[PDB]
């Protein structure tokens, strides 16, 4: 579906229509480092915050999944991916949910676009 890139440039996150978030460590494998299948509908967008170690996935089920991903330059330190929040209460119109998600360049603010014409600013 969509892709996002870590600011360090060594990590890629792939959103899929198969309800999967794919974390790739470019120095680890051409295979996905982790696969996550929490969404109930097709996942639309994945975005990494440019500064803070948080990334989010927006899907058509209306739920926005917020993950904390910590990345260290060390070879031993594999990236630490943990669930942090599951933002809900977003409408679905014509079986279309969270279409696009964007991160504030400075602080942990998430802009979510729904199918009903509403923009949610999760603080």
């Amino acid at each position: 579906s969509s892709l996002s890139v870590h600011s360090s440039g060594d990590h890629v996150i792939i959103g899929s229509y198969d309800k999967r978030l794919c974390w790739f460590d470019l120095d680890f494998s051409s295979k996905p480092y982790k696969n996550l299948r929490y969404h109930s509908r097709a996942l639309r967008d994945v975005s990494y915050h440019p500064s803070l170690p948080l990334f989010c996935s927006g899907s058509d089920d209306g739920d926005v999944q917020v993950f904390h991903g910590r990345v260290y330059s060390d070879l031993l330190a594999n990236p630490l991916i943990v669930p942090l929040k599951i933002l809900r209460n977003h409408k679905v119109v014509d079986n279309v949910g969270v279409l696009s998600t964007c991160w504030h360049p400075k602080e942990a603010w998430l802009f979510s676009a729904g199918a009903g014409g509403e923009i949610r600013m999760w603080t």
């Binding site: 982790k34 696969n35 996550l36 929490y38 991916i81 669930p83 599951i86």
Partner: peptide, 24 residues
Amino acid sequence: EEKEAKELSKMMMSNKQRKLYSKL
């Protein structure tokens, strides 16, 4: 704490043993 304890199912497939939590 309970919500994060119940929702921590990282990529594990067969290691996911929530069958016990669903019956017992």
